[PDB]
Write a protein that binds this ligand. Structure first.
Ligand code: 0HZ
Ligand code: 0HZ
Ligand code: CA
Ligand code: CA
Lengths: 200, 200
């Protein structure tokens, strides 16, 4: 009975990656970089704040599972110290907020395990998954799931509109946010899904 | 196995109210007014932004149930227009963040039903329930439950610490927030509970 709203590059499968544990450092297509505190440079480099896709496939050295979906995850890595701000992915949809409708936003959240060239992947920065109408956060899961090194869990965000919602007709949106509340301050997302169902 | 952390005036039962549907307009004891955008006047009046307790007992004209707990609920009413900011209740606890511990914060959220002297109680401003360590929001439920006129639902907020959490030893805190994202822009809370359990 719930209808899916299509999401562009919903599984971070674009771009295609050939080598397990390789990654990009440029915003994945379908998404924009959400960067209210100007943490992410326009000219991207490894080992500085960035986002992109990572190939989590057979033989990965940094996870205890494959990607939740397909080959790739999407990641946001912030090198600034905890407390410096929040950043992540945003996607504004063509779909608009409808009255007497329940929205269900689901996304898998994970993080690296282990260490790399002296940088520990122990610890987690906190995540927030947001459903938007216009620039309003209708509903969000601020860090309620415990995200273990190298593993993913599914976040569920729900919003129910009324017949007189202030935000009716505004574009729906999704944000996937690195809260930078601790280190290691990289975070992964995959398999974004959004459904709509009329209320009874 | 989960241990309760005591909360002062956890059910907004203080002060005691004699008459059903009567209310106070002063901060309930045990709590402070969270008011980052300076919406709430120090000199309180009815029909302006305020908070207090309300007696939701037999014969109430504005609910479809009694208070979730005891006689009273705690409310936050904001008369400013949607988008003006957020405000609510805060309580900072003596308890501090411990390592390898799961925290479970539960609170009932509700709102008035009907109308009063020309002001409609239709609509809802959005809620957020926050668990803090120091000034950090560890975990929050931003408006995931649909809160029907005159009824309450239970919000659950969870956080799991690590052995190296940045915020270990900082005071735990609770915020109960009116998001002022729509009107009618009054919101109720009751029956605040916080438990701790060691992780396996
Ligand atoms: N292949 C993956 N699953 N993820 C790639 C993560 C890349 C991300 N950005 C970087 O520049 C590297 C530097 C070291 C840690 N990194 C990160 O955490
Ligand atoms: N008795 C209750 N359950 N709630 C009392 C709510 C009081 C709160 N504050 C006020 O000043 C009144 C003005 C009209 C609407 N009010 C509100 O919503
Ligand atoms: Ca994927
Ligand atoms: Ca009570």
């Amino acid at each position: 009975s719930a209808v899916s709203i299509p999401i562009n590059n919903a599984g971070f499968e674009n771009p295609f990656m050939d080598v397990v544990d390789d990654y990009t450092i440029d915003t994945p297509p379908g998404w924009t970089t959400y960067d209210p505190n100007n943490l992410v440079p326009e000219k991207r480099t490894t080992w500085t704040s960035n986002n992109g896709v990572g190939y989590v496939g057979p033989g990965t050295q940094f996870y205890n599972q494959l990607a939740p979906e397909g080959r790739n995850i999407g990641y946001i890595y912030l090198s600034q110290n905890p407390g410096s701000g929040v950043a992540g992915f945003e996607q504004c949809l063509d779909a608009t907020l409808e009255p007497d409708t329940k929205y269900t936003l689901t996304v898998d959240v994970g993080a690296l395990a282990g260490t790399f060239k002296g940088l520990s992947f122990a610890g987690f920065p906190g995540y927030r998954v947001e459903l938007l109408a216009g620039d309003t956060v209708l509903a969000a899961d601020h860090n309620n799931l415990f995200i273990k090194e190298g593993e993913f869990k599914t976040s569920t965000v729900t919003y129910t509109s009324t017949a007189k919602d202030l935000h009716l007709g505004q574009k729906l949106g999704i944000r996937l946010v690195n809260l930078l509340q601790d280190k290691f301050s990289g975070l992964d997302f995959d398999n974004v899904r959004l459904t709509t169902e009329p209320t009874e």
